[PDB]
Design a protein around this ligand. Structure first.
Ligand SMILES: *[C@@H]1O[C@H](CO)[C@@H](O[C@@H]2O[C@H](CO)[C@@H](O)[C@H](O)[C@H]2NC(C)=O)[C@H](O)[C@H]1NC(C)=O
Ligand SMILES: *[C@@H]1O[C@H](CO)[C@@H](O[C@@H]2O[C@H](CO)[C@@H](O)[C@H](O)[C@H]2NC(C)=O)[C@H](O)[C@H]1NC(C)=O
Ligand SMILES: *[C@@H]1O[C@H](CO)[C@@H](O)[C@H](O)[C@H]1NC(C)=O
Ligand SMILES: *[C@@H]1O[C@H](CO)[C@@H](O)[C@H](O)[C@H]1NC(C)=O
Ligand code: NA
Ligand code: NA
Lengths: 723, 723
């Protein structure tokens, strides 16, 4: 019980090295160990996130809601009470794990407790009065999402846009300085004009130049001055070529540079944190013996709690893979590489195929012959001609049937023939190569997926299921196979498919900002946009709904911009998505401000600044990752190969049978014995493959100054371990 | 005559090292030397450019012209004949300088001869018929501009956008591939709708999705589908978030990376070309003596033809500054640095001020005391409070006089008092510091310039000159002094003012592309846009001009987009500038195509692709230069200090009086003798300051692999100098 307490404690010291938290897990009692084990279970994470998504997705049943989900007020008030009750359960177990002083000084938990208190109080107020008040506190409900473990990518993304914000704010200050100067001079030059509503008041000119900054109304503000005096074009040329050409590109440059330094120090602090984590782990497995090292049974324990799904043969392989010495023990230099060796999967050296062992003759030459021909180059070179024939067939059938080849309810024999030939070569390729040897590439599962949609088109044509005909309309996705010829497409789609998870996280941060702005706009802008509204405004043309009932058929004219409501979450997400692409945003602004006040211009101006920050940080991320990988591949997974003897396997078998593990460890070592008996050899030569990530990539790039970081951090340990 | 022929030939070998041309100047006769000297005179350059700008600026007098400059047809036909006659004079002297084989194999000159031939022939045709034909050949007239010497920056910029074009074109191909897929499926889903003109035909849907790609009509195309089925938002969300979020940012990343490699190899090939230039220069000054080196009188000759304006004392200073050895001769290692030492200006060590030598007492304590106090910190700290008082005064007077503080014809005592205090401290600072010690900074000449505008405001207020009142309207430019407090503004405005010449060149390349597209659109789109035109089109609302003559005052409504003509060069430059900022470009497209054909959509689509290339290359340039300087200042002009003795100055005086130069060399060495006699010393200690450029910056950055470039190039000389 003493050793296993040391093994679980040391396995915690490795697990906390990856998630960038400071070290708090040191137990005085075993109750803290049981509390860590209770709160870092996989079930606790899924409970925490599913409560958070229930608490967000309940907001489409509130007093502004879709009409099909309009619950009664006590129902959703009680559902908020139960969801907040189990969030109190979450914080109760967090308090049991940490202390009391650590639970207060930790900032993130205290933020979540405060938001819990205010939403709990206002929920009880709703349940008493049974009428919803203004209830603007729902915008803070995102904090329950972001504190979860599964969106820690969202969290470090969000602090990365926080840290890059001062070099944004100063250049934003310079840009606003020039628009106030040009708004003053614009008010002087064009206010003496009874024809334009664009420069009637100095505040109205500040508004119209803030909209001109983002290129939203450019010719329409220039024209009434350009009608009188043709030399007024120099005003808008000089203004727009200062801001759109100097200052905006300057802003992209400055945020890009700061993003580079933040990436460098993020990597550095992660390395130093992993360094102290491994040093504490080696310290807990101290020897009190005349050599300094770790015996094999302790490394059994570390791989028995950390990485629990790794069996015995791979455990001994990881012990030799870290060894790199002819010793019975380990070191530190041969032990700091534990993160990059324990992450791989081990295989033996067979040469078989997954569909040949059952086979006798008279059919083995068939399938082996298919594997032979499917490895040939001219077969692939035949397949690209088939795809090109498909593409010319779609193009010629298009410009012969005059574009009417898609609405018809009979397929003109193209999609039948082509899906047959793609399908039989799909089945031939998979059965020829084996399933896992086929799935291991990238483009092949794309071929499998798109034909997998495509057979449902045949399920849609011959049967009585009309609305699946759009799969038949998606013929030309098969031409996307053909991009794998040119080299730059393979490179740039490799980096596209490798940057996808971070762009998913950036998208979810953007949905956080949309959620809070959608709620805080949902309450104040509820029913202020109707058809034929805002008729006294200046953009009254866009809000119109006119019947022309001549001929008893009432042909209707409408400008449709009244559909951008703020009625529920769904119309407001569609509206806010129409504001982040920039064009025609001042129409929604001038409509809402023509119904509420002058102060609600400030809502939309603030929204444009926030979406400007988020989009320029997305651009900066894509540029850094693409430049970093392109600099790697012009300065040059991984496969390791080791081997173990027969007698070492027998002795380790004696130790494992002594230690009395499960039957799987014994019988898989017996299976290794059967492989040595069937092949009639002495040593088992193995392979371990690991995929290459950004961490090892950054180690190869910053390999010049990294030793200075280690040595400086070593003496800063000694300055902080004499006190 | 033998030595001076060697000096002028070697000075040519240095001058051709900078301008990246290959070596052709080797003379068999002195006539080639006289031809080089005739064609690289400063007068020849100014003749070449002024002919080119006359030939471009004549195009605003043609058959499409402004009505105030409408010349007769024989007049401008003859002016084209004379301008092309002197361009033939230019090519005649170019042919005299080179050979005949070199003049043909050189590509750039042969391009200019061919364009000369076709414009000469069509000019004679105009002079015969006296009526202008379609005359589309004027778009090629830009080649006469770009071949000049003063816009060689334009030329290397233009080949840099040529070389970066394939990694643009392949991703453009992928982006067009996805818009054709979504146009097919958009035509299937929304053609069964009698309410929208956006998906009536497959070609019309390809057009509207190509416009949706550039965010020009985003809500207006979404709405008629969004009115029927609210789930049609997923179509435009998925489409716009593939293209605007993955592919467009991918295009910026790819063009950025290629721009980095092109910058690296541009710097490398410039270094190797300078290397061979100096080796030929040292070869022409070969010794045929028992040491290997260059005597002083030959270095006199090199500095007498190369850098002619450098006098004798600075010549000897440059001979010791290259020496770095106790030798009477030179080397190669001490001679490859000739470009970076000959570029500086030498000064002595005085300590006086430019306004103190005349002064006796009773006024010397005045001006010296002013220099004392103007060097003090709390005086500057007083001045920033004065500027902040000015800013709060403008703001409070604005929100007290309700924005009407600018139209009034009396100044409310602010601009009088503030221009007096800024003015007296300007004169106090300049007279206290001296003129050249004041101008040498950056912000100080900004203060001088803005107050220099500001006194003309007092010339405008009290006098009978009304239209200069806008200088009084430009009060708040004085607040731009106050940005020099925060550090990041000083850094980012240093890089802004240091990247300005290249952005000027990028702007002039953009005006080249506008010029050719303005002419080729001027002839075919001449009178096709009138008021109340295009009424059968779909954008007929924008072209309207209606009188409402009730009440005998005729209040007029108009949509103003008929002013974007193609009548002359000036309305067409204003139109094309309205197309490069993107917004509302499809209205000009749909108008012109509603008057000509369907084929003139292709004009505007081609223009959007061209301006997309040019703008993303401007963005890539700003990012590289800003990142490069920010990486320099986080891995860390120049001043050198040397001295010469008295006897060395006397001996070199004997040699210069032997060689019988002008009186300036003798009498300035006599002035150095008078300084040694007045200060009563032995040695003159001097300083040479040089401004830091991108070349030395790049030498400090790429200092790791540069020796490999030199040694590889040395053996590639030996492989190319055994044959
Ligand atoms: C502009 O809109 C207002 C409503 O905001 C219209 O005013 C209404 O006019 C009708 C006559 O058609 C009256 O019966 C209502 O009592 C008015 N309502 C209010 C609140 O005043 C106005 O007519 C519209 N102007 C137009 C369409 O030109
Ligand atoms: C649309 O514009 C055309 C001109 O392009 C107009 O057609 C003219 O109509 C007037 C009657 O007002 C006739 O006298 C002319 O002979 C017509 N010209 C041509 C070339 O057909 C037409 O009326 C306009 N339609 C509107 C304003 O609804
Ligand atoms: C137009 O007529 C329809 C009935 O066909 C009606 O539903 C709609 O409200 C009318 N629009 C008005 C009165 O603005
Ligand atoms: C409107 O009236 C003015 C005269 O005040 C005239 O110049 C203009 O051509 C008229 N516009 C029309 C008839 O469209
Ligand atoms: Na836009
Ligand atoms: Na951009």
């Amino acid at each position: 019980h003493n050793w296993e307490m040391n093994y679980q404690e040391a396995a915690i010291y490795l697990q906390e090295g990856q998630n960038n938290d400071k070290f708090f897990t040191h137990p005085k009692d075993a109750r803290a160990l049981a509390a860590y084990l209770f709160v870092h279970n996989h079930f606790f994470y899924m409970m925490e996130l599913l409560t958070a998504l229930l608490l967000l997705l309940l907001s489409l049943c509130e007093s502004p809601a879709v009409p099909v989900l309009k619950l009664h007020t006590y129902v959703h008030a009680t559902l908020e009470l139960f969801a907040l009750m189990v969030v109190v359960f979450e914080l109760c177990m967090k308090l049991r794990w940490l202390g009391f002083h650590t639970f207060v000084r930790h900032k993130r938990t205290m933020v979540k407790t405060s938001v819990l208190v205010v939403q709990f109080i206002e929920a009880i107020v709703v349940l008493v009065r049974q009428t919803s008040h203004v209830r603007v506190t729902r915008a803070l409900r995102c904090i329950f999402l972001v504190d979860c473990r599964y969106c820690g990518g969202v969290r470090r993304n969000l602090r990365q846009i926080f840290q890059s914000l001062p070099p944004f704010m100063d250049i934003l200050l310079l840009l606003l300085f020039f628009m106030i100067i040009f708004a003053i001079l614009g008010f002087y030059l064009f206010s003496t004009n009874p024809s334009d509503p664009y420069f009637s008041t100095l505040e109205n000119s500040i508004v119209n130049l803030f909209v001109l900054l983002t290129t939203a109304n450019f010719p329409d503000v220039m024209m009434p001055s350009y009608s009188r005096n043709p030399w007024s074009c120099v005003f808008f040329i000089v203004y727009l070529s200062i801001e759109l050409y100097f200052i905006m590109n300057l802003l992209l440059a400055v945020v890009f540079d700061t993003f580079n330094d933040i990436e460098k120090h993020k990597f550095k602090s992660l390395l130093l944190h992993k360094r102290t984590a491994i040093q504490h782990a080696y310290g807990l497995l101290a020897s009190q013996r005349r050599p300094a090292g770790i015996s094999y049974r302790q490394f059994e324990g570390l791989m028995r709690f950390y990485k629990p799904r790794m069996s015995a043969r791979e455990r001994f392989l990881t012990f030799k893979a870290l060894n790199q010495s002819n010793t019975p023990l380990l070191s530190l230099k041969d032990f700091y590489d534990i993160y990059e060796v324990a992450a791989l999967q081990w295989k033996a050296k067979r040469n078989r195929q997954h569909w040949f062992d059952e086979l006798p003759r008279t059919a083995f030459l068939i399938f082996k012959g298919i594997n032979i021909l499917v490895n040939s180059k001219a077969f692939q070179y035949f397949m690209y001609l088939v795809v090109a024939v498909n593409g010319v067939w779609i193009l010629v059938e298009t410009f012969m049937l005059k574009g009417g080849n898609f609405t018809s309810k009979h397929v003109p024999w193209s999609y039948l023939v082509f899906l047959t030939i793609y399908g039989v070569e799909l089945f031939m390729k998979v059965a020829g190569l084996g399933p896992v040897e086929y799935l291991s590439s990238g483009w092949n599962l794309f071929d499998f997926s798109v034909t997998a949609f495509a057979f449902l088109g045949l399920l849609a044509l011959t049967l009585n299921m009309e609305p699946f005909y759009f799969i038949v309309v998606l013929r030309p996705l098969q031409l996307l196979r053909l991009f794998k010829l040119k080299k730059r497409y393979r490179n740039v789609l490799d980096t596209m498919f490798e940057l996808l998870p971070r762009m998913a996280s950036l998208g979810l941060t953007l949905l956080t900002f949309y959620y809070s702005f959608a709620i805080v706009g949902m309450e104040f802008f509820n029913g202020r946009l109707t058809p034929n509204c805002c008729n006294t405004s200046t953009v009254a043309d866009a809000y119109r709904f006119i019947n022309h009932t001549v001929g008893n058929k009432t042909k209707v004219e409408e400008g449709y911009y009244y559909l951008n409501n703020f009625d529920n979450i769904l119309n407001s997400f569609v509206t806010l998505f129409e504001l982040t692409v920039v064009n025609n945003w001042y129409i929604i602004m001038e409509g809402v401000t023509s119904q509420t006040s002058h102060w609600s211009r400030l809502y939309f101006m603030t929204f444009y600044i926030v979406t400007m920050v988020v989009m320029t940080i997305i651009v900066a991320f894509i540029l850094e990752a693409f430049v970093f990988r392109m600099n790697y591949s012009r300065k040059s997974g991984i496969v390791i190969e080791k081997e173990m003897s027969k007698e070492e396997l027998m002795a380790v078998l004696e130790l494992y049978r002594e230690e009395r593990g499960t039957s799987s460890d014994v019988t898989r070592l017996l299976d290794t014995l059967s492989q040595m008996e069937k092949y009639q050899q002495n040593s088992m030569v193995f392979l371990g493959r690991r995929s290459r990530t950004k961490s090892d990539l950054s180690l190869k790039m910053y390999q010049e100054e990294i030793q200075e970081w280690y040595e400086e951090h070593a003496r800063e340990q000694e300055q902080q371990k004499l006190r």
